[PDB]
């Protein structure tokens, strides 16, 4: 195995395959990157046995086919540490990989390519392509609502749902829900899958922002995403995600509109004096007014009064302020609409000007 590649063209691939390869690995080979030269292409693979990252680098300079595994972080650091425009000459020399550029020389320990975990091939059941910005939006709009190490393991991931020409992301922790729908301009079959937390993080991480579209392929127990010459593959969460459609309030009688920033700032201030563990705040809704109150065990109290657009019956609803703030911070719009039923039923929060994302927050007592 031998190849010579320009640093700037090895960097992003190494960053995309080695970036997710973190911490003390289970097997030592998991801390390694599989390098394979074949057909004028260098393939770089990083794995954790569940999720896989494969990058393909075109070799426009002389090369010799072969394969080996090298410590990922050390190899990335060497290439990154080399100067701008550096030509990186790589060669396998026994049980060690040689890296040469200018007057810089490195000999890395190898582990056999044959010992590298090869993930079984699988058949894609649903596939579609979409802009990176659309995937970013779908994830960012709902990611915060995913559960954190919940016993209901299926809640620690994000649901990816296809229906007609829409791709939808759903995330819930059983207390609050986030749902984002985006039109994808391709007729899709009705499919629903749960992507694990780490797969979600990686899907976000792989989005460079650029012109490259993202090609998603979903199988029965795996998901793969292609962006340029990078292939991210993740196992799916084998579980049944709750039905978001049921969770959505049927026909709310009460509708409140407020400036997102004024509302956010009032909640952020009341949050300071709320219970550190329970984060409970009280909302008192009245004609064109919202009063937010918070108190903690040390009997400290916060009160905020805001002008809102509310034409309905006066009501008092309790909420975990963190859940509300998470929604208000995820919204990034001028005005928000809160759709309420009663004090013991969930609120739906959305951008007053858009129904693409909806946030359902169950109240407290």
């Amino acid at each position: 195995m031998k190849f010579t590649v320009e640093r700037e063209h090895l960097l992003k691939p190494l960053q995309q395959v080695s970036g997710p390869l973190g911490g003390r690995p289970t097997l030592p080979i998991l801390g390694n990157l599989l390098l394979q030269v074949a057909d004028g292409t260098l393939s770089l693979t990083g794995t954790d046995l569940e999720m896989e990252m494969v990058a393909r680098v075109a070799l426009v300079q002389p090369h010799e086919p072969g394969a080996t595994t090298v410590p990922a972080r050390k190899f990335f650091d060497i290439c990154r540490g080399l100067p701008e425009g550096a030509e990186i000459a790589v060669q396998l020399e026994g049980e060690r990989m040689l890296v040469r550029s200018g007057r810089s020389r490195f000999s890395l320990s190898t582990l056999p390519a044959a010992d590298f975990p090869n993930l079984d091939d699988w058949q894609s059941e649903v596939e579609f392509t979409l802009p990176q910005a659309t995937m970013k939006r779908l994830i960012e709009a709902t990611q915060f609502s995913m559960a954190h190490q919940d016993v209901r393991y299926y809640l620690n991931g994000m649901l990816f749902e296809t229906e007609g020409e829409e791709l939808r992301t759903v995330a819930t922790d059983g207390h609050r829900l986030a749902v984002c729908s985006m039109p994808i301009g391709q007729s899709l079959p009705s499919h629903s899958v749960i992507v694990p937390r780490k797969g979600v993080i990686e899907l976000m991480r792989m989005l460079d922002g650029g012109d490259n579209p993202l090609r998603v392929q979903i199988g029965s127990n795996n998901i793969r995403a292609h962006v340029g010459d990078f292939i991210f593959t993740s196992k799916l969460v084998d579980g049944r995600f709750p039905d978001y459609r049921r969770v959505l309030p049927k026909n709310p009688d009460k509708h409140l509109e407020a400036g997102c920033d004024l509302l956010k700032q009032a909640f952020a201030r009341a949050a300071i004096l709320s219970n550190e563990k329970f984060r409970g705040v009280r909302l008192y809704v009245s004609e064109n007014q919202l009063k937010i109150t918070a108190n903690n065990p040390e009997q400290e109290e916060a009160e905020e009064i805001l002008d809102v657009t509310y034409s309905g019956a006066e009501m008092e609803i309790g909420f975990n302020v963190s859940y509300v703030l998470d929604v208000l911070n995820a919204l990034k719009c001028e005005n928000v609409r809160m759709m309420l039923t009663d004090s013991v039923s969930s609120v739906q929060i959305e951008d007053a000007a858009s129904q693409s994302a909806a946030y359902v927050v169950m109240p407290m007592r």
Partner: peptide, 5 residues
């Protein structure tokens, strides 16, 4: 804290 489901 009430639950959605």
């Amino acid at each position: 804290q009430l639950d959605l489901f």
